[PDB]
Design a protein around this ligand. Sequence first.
Ligand SMILES: Nc1ncnc2c1ncn2[C@@H]1O[C@H](COP(=O)(O)OP(=O)(O)O)[C@@H](O)[C@H]1O
Lengths: 49, 249, 50, 117, 195, 195
Amino acid sequence: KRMSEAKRVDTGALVEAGADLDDIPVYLQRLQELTEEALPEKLNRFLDY
Amino acid sequence: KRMSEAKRVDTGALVEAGADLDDIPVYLQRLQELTEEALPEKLNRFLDYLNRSSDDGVTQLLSHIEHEVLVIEERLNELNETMFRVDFQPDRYLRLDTKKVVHESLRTLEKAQRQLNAARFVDDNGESHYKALQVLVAQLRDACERNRTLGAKALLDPRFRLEFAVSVMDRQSGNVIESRTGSQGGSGGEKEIIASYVLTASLSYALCPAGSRYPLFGTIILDEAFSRSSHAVAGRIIAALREFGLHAV
Amino acid sequence: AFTLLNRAAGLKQLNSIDEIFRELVLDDHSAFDRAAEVANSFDGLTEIHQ
Amino acid sequence: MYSPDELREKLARQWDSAKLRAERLLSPGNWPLCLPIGKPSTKIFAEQTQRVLQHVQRWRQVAVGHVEWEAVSFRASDTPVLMPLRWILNSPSEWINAAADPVVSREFRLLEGIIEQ
Amino acid sequence: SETRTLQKIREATQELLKYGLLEEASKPNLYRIVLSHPEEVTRILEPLDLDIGIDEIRGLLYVKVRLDETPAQDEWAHPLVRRQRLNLEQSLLVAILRQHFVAWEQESGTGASQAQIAIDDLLPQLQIYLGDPGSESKERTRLLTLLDQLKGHGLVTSPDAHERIVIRPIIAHLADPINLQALLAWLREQIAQQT
Amino acid sequence: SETRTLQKIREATQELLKYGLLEEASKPNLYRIVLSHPEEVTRILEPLDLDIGIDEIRGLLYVKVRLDETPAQDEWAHPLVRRQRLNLEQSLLVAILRQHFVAWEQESGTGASQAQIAIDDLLPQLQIYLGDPGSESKERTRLLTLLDQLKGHGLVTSPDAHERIVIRPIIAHLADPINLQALLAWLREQIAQQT
DNA sequence: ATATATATATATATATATATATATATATATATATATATAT
DNA sequence: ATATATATATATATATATATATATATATATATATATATAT
Ligand SMILES: Nc1ncnc2c1ncn2[C@@H]1O[C@H](COP(=O)(O)OP(=O)(O)O)[C@@H](O)[C@H]1O
């Protein structure tokens, strides 16, 4: 259920793999990547610029 | 997976539904309901309104514009006929001429129309019919938002569907000698002759009641006399005015 | 005729014969109004189709 | 443009002739039997668009016998459009189906019995 | 009797030779003539030690040096080719143009030809490498000098009224990524030279 | 599948196309190879609507167009062949070379001995009409530039150690020298009037 | 039951429109020569 | 002071676009013949 919910909101990355107990590693890799960039946490300084 | 997909596509009829087997009958109810009732109803609605729109659709507008251009064709002949009864020069009379406009938009509309005709006969429950209708209506919309543009004018205005010209006629043989102002020039003061003559003739015709050989009303107002013209042009104008029997002020 | 007359009182512009026809002799009767409502009803039909 | 009604009426008029019934039983060479539907032309198609489409709709719903179909080009149409041209009945049973009257059944059965009875 | 080639085939091949490339979008009739007898085109170029390159995804045809029993050695030494050899800064600007081309391809697909960039858009990209002459007009002259030659090879259109250029699809093959790796190696030997 | 064209035929055909005209005395091997494979060469060239003209008396091969017979373009135009209109000075020098080549082919044979003339002999012929340009150095520069341009046209060779050029046989292969004859008549008439 | 009157289906002819080929004008690219500026 | 590079002028040739004329195909009109229905 959770993988499908993630697929619903994805844009461009989960598009490739499916959703099964063998696909899992791709999801975690994407989460690690979107944690490295720390991107979602620039928001309230950029809304100033 | 299947039910999660269905709820993802769901518009909201399955909002309260969950994700486990026991909820399955809820989904099946919607499946059977949609299949049996909703789809036939919507099909009938759409096809019925399209059939109504088929008679009331753009075809009537196109026919109306064709009728208006036909009316213009009619009346121009009557004024052209009246000019045979008088002479623009001591040896000549004058004749009107017209032609069709060729701005490409009209040809595109022609193609869209001829394609739309066939699409009604396609056995698809009105699908291709609707597609062609939308495609054609696109032209009308675009012209409407740009009515000022000459292309939209030609699309919608009967006056811009055709062009006009005038021929010099031999009073003796009735033959044409020329169809152009081959003496135009100077400071542009010569063009006024033919323009003033034709305008005067049209005004003369407009004031003749049904079958009246004369106009019933004879007063005409010309403010500023001949400010633009030279000497002899005024004499020509006044002679023409006398020929039609008006009362100048 | 009883408005064309009023036009005659101010006749000064004679750029083209066909222009003179289109501006003084004929009438306009352009059908922009018809097209607007025709397309707007087509929108309602499009909603059912959608 | 003949609707199925006119062709059916013509077949019934033929049925009025006892000799035609007798020959169509005694001379199976009378079968198959067919009638034309109409002659489409641009003079009709050009402005009778909806009427022609509705006539085609009516003929589309016919099942008895068979209906001939093919595409006819017209000046106002960008491509050829399917049209019906013929309606075919293959056996006396089809002719009786078209006639569809109690007296028709009476005479058909009575004559098919008389020839043997 | 005589081995005269069919007139349409001769027309198409003559045009292809005259310009060295042929796009269906531009000249569909000759392109389809070529792809109707592409083996004929090959067997005619084979006498000349030349070969036909085909890329239908972009609707493109181009001529390429063939391999003789000797693979043309340095193929640019082939007698027929009228132009010189390619050389570095042309390759640099080709790489930048191909970068923009692949960006446009990801944006809207490969087969189309709408990609464009202005003279001023180009100028910083090369200015990175080539330094500043001291005046904007001089660097624009540099860029236009490059573009003239590259148009001479069919890579780009002429500088338009907006001071922009249109990428030609053939760049997909001059910037052949295999050839890009070979050129990267060649650049490494250039480093060795610098060493 | 289909076999390749023979290597030497390909090489010789490409060589001639590059040079337009060639001599057995220059490259006898290619000359003999082509003359032993004329059908193959013309089959190679006919798709281009091209062909070769030869002169064994003088020992020269040269290309020639082989379009369809006499189209409306009697002043022919061919895609692969861009034509030229040599200037009145170039035409004057060509007429001078034509007249002296005609004389040589009588006093020294039709290419039996390659047609020759000295720089100091050509210069007076030009000086008949153009006069003294101002100095001997200017005369030599003028004539040498024109002769080099003709050599690029494949008409003459560079002067030998004795400042004697050699005239290629192609001069005898011009199409319509009647224009050259009229031009020379006009020149001589003008100089006779202007003197 | 047969005759006749009328409807319609067909064939041919001619008119009209659309497609295509060709002729001509214009714009650009080559292209080559010469004159002038700048570098060594 | 000389040589080289560049820019401009002449200028010519080629390609492209657009308009008009011609040829062909399709459609429509008219006339005739045949089939069917009605009346005697
Ligand atoms: N485009 C043109 N059309 C017609 N005539 C022209 C045109 N250009 C110049 N002329 C001629 O040049 C003159 C223009 O008119 P001009 O005599 O200069 O005007 P005015 O003296 O009335 O101000 C006339 O002789 C006219 O015939």
